[PDB]
Design a binder for this molecule. Structure first.
Ligand SMILES: NC(=O)c1ccc[n+]([C@@H]2O[C@H](COP(=O)([O-])OP(=O)(O)OC[C@H]3O[C@@H](n4cnc5c(N)ncnc54)[C@H](O)[C@@H]3O)[C@@H](O)[C@H]2O)c1
Ligand SMILES: NCCCC[C@H](N)C(=O)NCCCC[C@H](N)C(=O)O
Ligand SMILES: [Mg+2]
Ligand code: NA
Length: 259
């Protein structure tokens, strides 16, 4: 239901440069490094076919151009097919793609035809954004607050629990908070009894989901969420270190995961 617009993807190369610097500042690693920690993998110029898809709301302005940019940035031999849909898929396989990258309104996937691995953008994004959050060099705690427990949030929290962090979760939807607590063992967080975190992961499609009362100074807020989870004011007031970028960090996570 929450979908990228062309405006979100303006100057994707700067957005990506900027997010990569923030990731380096927070964790000591660039995005490649994070991906190598998660998956053990690295790029070797694998050939990536990017197929536009016209189903649902259709082709999104700047979407495949941005994927072309992203993939090039990380050292893949990528290209965008002239035809969309099934015809484009055929064009890609025939033009030697080893990994297919394509999306409809519900699923963005990467499929590596050589080894059979396939990634879904939603867990891949939650996993990398959570990993990045957790690796905050100067956090001084293994307490992590996770706001948003849907298709992106839940796998991030799960990753974090598997990584032996002490995870506190909140979702405005009590059903999703309940499922996360009874399937993962996270501690349910209460906005009425807040404590401060130096590590925060947000995966929501809503503004101002991070209360002032949970922010410590210099804390990290890692969020795939659109629009921004915290106001500029609160972000300046606590010099929060923001990692937020619309497509490329999740895309890298999908790609490095199928290698
Ligand atoms: N930057 C990227 O690369 C990237 C990749 C994937 C998704 N996204 C974005 O991530 C966001 C989340 O995606 P999703 O698929 O998990 O959505 P989802 O609907 O599956 O989950 C969103 C969750 O946030 C909860 N929520 C809404 N307002 C809240 C509030 N104030 N407090 C706590 N919880 C609240 C909802 O109850 C819901 O459970 C969307 O904005 C989507 O566009 C970004
Ligand atoms: N950046 C958020 C995560 C990636 C998926 C994103 N939610 C999204 O907008 N998905 C829809 C993508 C549709 C792509 C369209 N069929 C196209 O090929 O241009
Ligand atoms: Mg991203
Ligand atoms: Na948000």
């Amino acid at each position: 239901m929450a979908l990228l617009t062309p405006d979100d993807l303006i100057n994707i190369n700067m957005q990506l440069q900027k997010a990569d610097s923030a990731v380096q500042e927070v964790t000591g690693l660039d995005i490649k490094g994070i991906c190598k920690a998660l998956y053990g993998t690295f790029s070797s110029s694998e050939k990536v076919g990017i197929v536009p898809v016209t189903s649902g709301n259709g082709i999104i302005g700047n979407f495949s151009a941005s994927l072309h940019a992203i993939t090039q940035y990380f050292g893949f031999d990528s290209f965008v097919t002239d035809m969309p849909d099934v015809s484009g898929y055929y064009e890609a396989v025939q033009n030697g793609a080893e990994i297919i990258l394509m999306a409809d309104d519900r699923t963005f996937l990467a499929h590596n035809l050589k080894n059979g691995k396939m990634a879904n953008n939603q867990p891949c994004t939650g996993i990398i954004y959570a990993e990045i959050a957790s690796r905050y060099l100067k956090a001084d705690s293994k307490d992590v607050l996770v706001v948003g427990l849907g298709k992106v949030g839940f796998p991030g929290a799960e990753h974090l629990v598997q990584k032996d962090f002490r995870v506190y979760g909140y979702d405005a939807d009590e059903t999703l908070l309940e499922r996360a607590t009874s399937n993962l063992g996270i501690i349910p967080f209460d906005p009425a009894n807040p404590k401060k975190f130096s590590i925060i992961f947000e995966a929501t499609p809503c503004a101002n989901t991070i209360p002032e009362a949970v922010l410590s100074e210099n804390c990290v807020l890692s969020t795939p969420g659109i629009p921004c989870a915290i106001s500029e004011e609160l972000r300046d007031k606590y010099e929060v270190q923001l990692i937020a970028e619309p497509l490329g960090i999740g895309t890298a996570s999908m790609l490095y995961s199928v290698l």
